[PDB]
From Swiss-Prot, chain A:
Barely detectable in differentiated tissues. Expressed in embryonic stem cells and in other dividing cells, such as some tumor cell lines. It comes from the Eukaryota. DNA-dependent RNA polymerase catalyzes the transcription of DNA into RNA using the four ribonucleoside triphosphates as substrates. Specific peripheric component of RNA polymerase III (Pol III) which synthesizes small non-coding RNAs including 5S rRNA, snRNAs, tRNAs and miRNAs from at least 500 distinct genomic loci. Acts as a long tether that bridges POLR3C/RPC3-POLR3F/RPC6-POLR3G/RPC7 heterotrimer and the mobile stalk of Pol III, coordinating the dynamics of Pol III stalk and clamp modules during the transition from apo to elongation state. It comes from Homo sapiens. Belongs to the eukaryotic RPC7 RNA polymerase subunit family. This is DNA-directed RNA polymerase III subunit RPC7. It is found in: Nucleus; Cytoplasm. The chain holds residues 28 to 112 of 223 of the full protein.
From Swiss-Prot, chain B:
It comes from Homo sapiens (Human). Catalytic core component of RNA polymerase III (Pol III), a DNA-dependent RNA polymerase which synthesizes small non-coding RNAs using the four ribonucleoside triphosphates as substrates. Synthesizes 5S rRNA, snRNAs, tRNAs and miRNAs from at least 500 distinct genomic loci. Pol III-mediated transcription cycle proceeds through transcription initiation, transcription elongation and transcription termination stages. During transcription initiation, Pol III is recruited to DNA promoters type I, II or III with the help of general transcription factors and other specific initiation factors. Belongs to the RNA polymerase beta' chain family. The lineage of its organism: Eukaryota, Metazoa, Chordata, Craniata, Vertebrata. This is DNA-directed RNA polymerase III subunit RPC1.
Curated annotation (Swiss-Prot), chain C:
GO terms for molecular function: 4 iron, 4 sulfur cluster binding; DNA-directed RNA polymerase activity; double-stranded DNA binding. This is DNA-directed RNA polymerase III subunit RPC6. The [4FE-4S] cluster-binding domain adopts a globular structure that serves as an interaction hub that connects the POLR3C/RPC3-POLR3F/RPC6-POLR3G/RPC7 heterotrimer to the Pol III core. Keywords: Acetylation, Antiviral defense, DNA-binding, DNA-directed RNA polymerase, Immunity, Innate immunity, Isopeptide bond, Nucleus, Transcription, Ubl conjugation. Coiled coil: none annotated. It is linked to Immunodeficiency 101, varicella zoster virus-specific: An autosomal dominant immunologic disorder characterized by reactivation of varicella zoster virus (VZV) infection in adulthood after primary childhood infection with VZV. The viral reactivation manifests as central nervous system vasculitis with stroke-like episodes and lacunar infarcts on brain imaging. Features include headache, hemiparesis, impaired balance, and other neurologic signs. The chain holds residues 169 to 316 of 316 of the full protein.
From Swiss-Prot, chain D:
Belongs to the eukaryotic RPC3/POLR3C RNA polymerase subunit family. Changing L268K: Loss of interaction with POLR3G and POLR3GL. No effect on interaction with POLR3F. PANTHER family: DNA-DIRECTED RNA POLYMERASE III SUBUNIT RPC3, RNA POLYMERASE III DNA DIRECTED -RELATED. GO terms for molecular function: DNA-directed RNA polymerase activity; single-stranded DNA binding. Keywords: Antiviral defense, DNA-binding, DNA-directed RNA polymerase, Immunity, Innate immunity, Nucleus, Phosphoprotein, Transcription. Antibodies against POLR3C have been found in the sera of patients with systemic sclerosis (SSc). InterPro entries: POLR3C_WHD (IPR055207), RNA_pol_III_RPC82-rel_HTH (IPR013197), RNA_pol_III_Rpc82_C (IPR008806), RPC3 (IPR039748), WH-like_DNA-bd_sf (IPR036388). GO terms for biological process: defense response to virus; DNA-templated transcription; innate immune response; positive regulation of innate immune response; positive regulation of interferon-beta production; regulation of transcription by RNA polymerase III. It comes from Homo sapiens (Human). The modification Phosphoserine is found at S182. GO terms for cellular component: cytosol; nucleoplasm; RNA polymerase III complex. It comes from the Eukaryota. This is DNA-directed RNA polymerase III subunit RPC3. It is found in: Nucleus.
Length: 85, 49, 139, 490
């Protein structure tokens, strides 16, 4: 029956240390494959990077804003007929 | 230097009251001090916390 | 009186495991093409008794129960297996390997973390200001 | 389903897809089926963006929809299909280890676009491969389609339900036909990769690897052969493999392995007479047939996973008691120590530390209608199903924490990153014009030591986290196959 006045640390030092990982040429191959899948699907039309953009005053520099807006064909035939954009 | 606009005194009414139960995580998030000691009074010069 | 010497007990256990591993070494280097006898190249309790006699560690121990209990503590570890056969009941012991390697679950520091319930973003202890995460990243 | 999986898929759809679409996707997991207008109302998002999110989710065959009471369309998002985006690299690697870059670049675009026609796959594969070569830019369409047929007849890429009112009811048939191509217009036929086949292949690989490093290297060839003849006749739910005999087995063995008949039967009986109990023989005095047990092997795999977790976290001495009480079911507290030669103090410590973390259960045996905690009997027992199900809930929050830690470090050194990358293009275009080593010392000393030392550590940390992610999500796959087999859809 003893009393503690100083509270325990928020990070109590663990019992043992974590385990190192397994590495093979396939492992870094899959790592680079995931790193390129994420970057490419970030640069896909399916990825909506256009929530909405607000512009208060109009400028003359309208030449450096030629963004190509090509949506994928939604294929409404094999799609719910109720939903029509 | 210029002063920033600030509301003078926020006067509002109470619309409605909602009932809910908290989680231990939110309880710790709101809590300030963690009691670990059971001794109420210290056995020193005078009654002191 | 039941003696207990944990150091002596576990060093005896390590020596017995090494001896059975060496028997498995000899069996595997032998490699008689018909391998029924290879898997049957076990070491019964009566031969680990001879090994106990050749150890020369401490003679105040009755062989049968001590060795069979140590092999029991070994099968509890998951390192060797026993099989009994009624001919007279003879117990043979074989050396088995682990089934699958250590999982990738625990290799992340989140598996070793003792504070798992309090872990949450937006407030106190979280993956952002975690000491274990930083200590894992620096190494 | 629970808060952990929802929190994980939220980030998985915020880093893969956009914020607007991931909002509606997560909102579809809290409520099963809801009308379009009610969704657009309670979510707070406008109608056009909601329709965009919905068509994005449908294009990746992530959400389904059905016709209800009057003519209404109820949408439903399944989380189990969403949580399988962490194994795309493993799927592509498994396609590339058997086949070559053909199958890899055929299937890697089938999972990034979901429903896609083969005329588009051949198109894009041919274009990318012609762009990859330098002098000879000739890629045969026939060899690209040959690997496609190899996927089609091995049941790797199947046909999604085609087109046969407020909407059309999509119907599926058993017509997995391959319409004959016309290489230099076939519409209404979309192909998609089949994931359960990949799961079956991974299960066979795990089984053969376990039986390899367990007893022998040769018997794994025999079981992998026994698992190769049943790829066509056996399915996933079926717990017992179709019966096969040894005479048919000796017919199909590898070419570089010459093993005779009676020694093969020797190996088969050694596999039958075995405590692991993977293969079981039902025969006669004359002959018989062998049957591979999948469920009783998955149970052993999950058990081994549990003991490995408790041995890495708690210790080997603790896992020893775990296995001791798993063997002797319902053992009592004072009789566990006469078996396990372990000091009573720290033994009780280990037992209580295990039970306080939900690793063991205690059952009550009272002799009175009153509970009487004093006058009662406690027994210690182990439950495999609940322990596997509770470790599965931990893995997901672990993966979520790893993803949050990986995403956290990028936004403090972000402007530094796109500023050091902006300097890269200043000299990348300059070197084309003419190499100036003075403009090189400009970039040699323009970046300071901590300005270049941050990327060095950030890349390593990102690599470490993304490599731990796969080692963790393989464990959830090994753990979700034992839970679903015992689950019986009544
Ligand atoms: S973020 Fe760190 S402290 Fe929090 S659960 Fe993960 S490993 Fe543990």
């Amino acid at each position: 029956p003893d009393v503690v006045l100083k509270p325990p640390p928020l990070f109590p030092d663990t019992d043992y240390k974590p385990v190192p990982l397994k590495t093979g040429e396939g492992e870094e191959y899959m790592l680079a494959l995931k790193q390129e899948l994420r970057e490419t699907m970030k640069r896909m039309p399916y990825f909506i990077e256009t929530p909405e953009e607000r512009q208060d005053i109009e400028r003359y520099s309208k030449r450096y804003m030629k963004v190509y807006k090509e949506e994928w064909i939604p294929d409404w035939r094999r799609l719910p007929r109720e939903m029509m954009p | 230097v210029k002063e920033q606009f600030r509301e003078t005194d926020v006067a509002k009414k109470i619309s409605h009251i909602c009932f809910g139960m908290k989680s231990p995580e939110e309880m710790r998030q709101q809590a300030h001090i963690q009691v670990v000691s059971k001794n109420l009074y210290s056995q020193d010069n005078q009654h002191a916390p | 009186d039941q003696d207990f010497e944990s150091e002596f007990v576990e060093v005896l256990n390590q020596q017995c495991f090494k001896f059975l591993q060496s028997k498995a070494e000899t069996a595997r280097e032998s490699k008689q093409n018909p391998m029924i006898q290879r898997n049957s190249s076990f070491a019964s309790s009566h031969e680990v008794w001879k090994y106990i006699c050749e150890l020369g560690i401490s003679k105040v121990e009755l062989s049968m129960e001590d060795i069979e209990t140590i092999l029991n503590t070994l099968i509890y570890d998951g390192k060797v297996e026993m099989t009994i056969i009624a001919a007279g009941h003879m117990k043979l012991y074989r050396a088995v390997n682990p089934i699958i390697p250590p999982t990738g679950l625990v290799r992340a520091p989140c598996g070793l973390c003792p504070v798992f319930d309090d872990c949450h973003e937006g407030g106190e202890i979280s993956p952002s200001n975690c000491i274990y995460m930083t200590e894992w990243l620096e190494f | 389903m629970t808060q952990a999986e929802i929190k994980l898929c939220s980030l998985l759809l915020q880093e893969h897809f956009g914020e607007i679409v991931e909002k509606i996707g997560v909102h579809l997991i809290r409520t099963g089926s809801q009308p379009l207008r009610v969704i657009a109302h309670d979510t707070g998002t406008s109608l056009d963006q909601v329709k965009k999110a919905l068509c994005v989710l449908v294009q990746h065959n992530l959400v389904s929809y059905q016709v209800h009471k009057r003519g209404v369309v109820e949408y439903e998002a399944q989380c189990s299909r969403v949580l399988r985006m962490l194994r795309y690299p493993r799927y592509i690697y498994t396609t590339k280890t058997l086949y070559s870059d053909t199958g890899e670049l055929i299937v890697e675009e089938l999972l990034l676009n979901g429903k896609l026609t083969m005329s588009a796959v051949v198109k894009k594969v041919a274009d990318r491969l012609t762009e990859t070569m330098e002098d000879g830019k000739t890629m045969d369409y026939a060899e690209v389609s040959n690997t496609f047929v190899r996927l089609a007849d091995t049941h790797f890429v199947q046909r999604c339900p085609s087109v046969p009112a407020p909407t059309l009811v999509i119907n599926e048939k058993d017509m997995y036909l391959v319409p004959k191509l016309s290489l230099i217009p076939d519409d209404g036929i979309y192909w998609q990769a089949n994931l359960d086949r990949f799961h079956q292949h991974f299960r066979d690989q795990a089984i053969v690897s376990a039986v390899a490093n367990r007893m022998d290297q040769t018997s794994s060839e025999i079981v992998r052969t026994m698992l190769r003849m049943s790829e066509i006749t056996t399915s996933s739910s079926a717990p017992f493999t179709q019966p096969l005999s040894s005479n048919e087995i000796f017919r199909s063995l590898p070419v570089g392995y010459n093993i005779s008949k009676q020694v093969l039967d020797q190996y088969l009986t050694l596999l039958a007479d075995d405590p692991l109990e993977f293969v079981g023989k039902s025969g006669d005095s004359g002959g018989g047939m062998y049957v591979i047990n999948l469920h009783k092997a998955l149970a052993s795999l999950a058990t081994a996973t549990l003991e490995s977790v408790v041995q890495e976290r708690f210790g080997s001495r603790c896992a020893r008691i775990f296995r001791l009480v798993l063997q002797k079911k319902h053992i009592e507290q004072k009789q566990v120590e006469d078996f396990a030669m372990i000091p009573a103090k720290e033994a009780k410590d280990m037992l209580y530390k295990m039970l306080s973390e939900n690793f063991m259960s205690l059952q009550e045996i009272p002799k009175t209608p009153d509970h009487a905690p004093s006058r009662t009997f406690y027994l210690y027992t182990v439950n495999i199903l609940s322990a596997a199900r509770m470790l599965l809930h931990r893995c997901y929050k672990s993966i979520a924490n790893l993803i949050e830690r990986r995403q956290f470090e990028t936004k403090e050194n972000k402007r530094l990153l796109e500023k050091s990358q902006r300097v890269e293009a200043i000299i990348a275009s300059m070197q084309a014009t003419g190499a100036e080593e003075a403009q090189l010392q400009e970039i040699e000393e323009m970046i300071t030591a901590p300005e270049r030392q941050q990327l060095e550590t950030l890349k390593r940390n990102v690599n470490k986290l993304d490599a731990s992610e796969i080692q963790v999500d393989e464990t959830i796959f090994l753990l979700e196959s034992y839970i679903e087999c015992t689950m019986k859809r009544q």
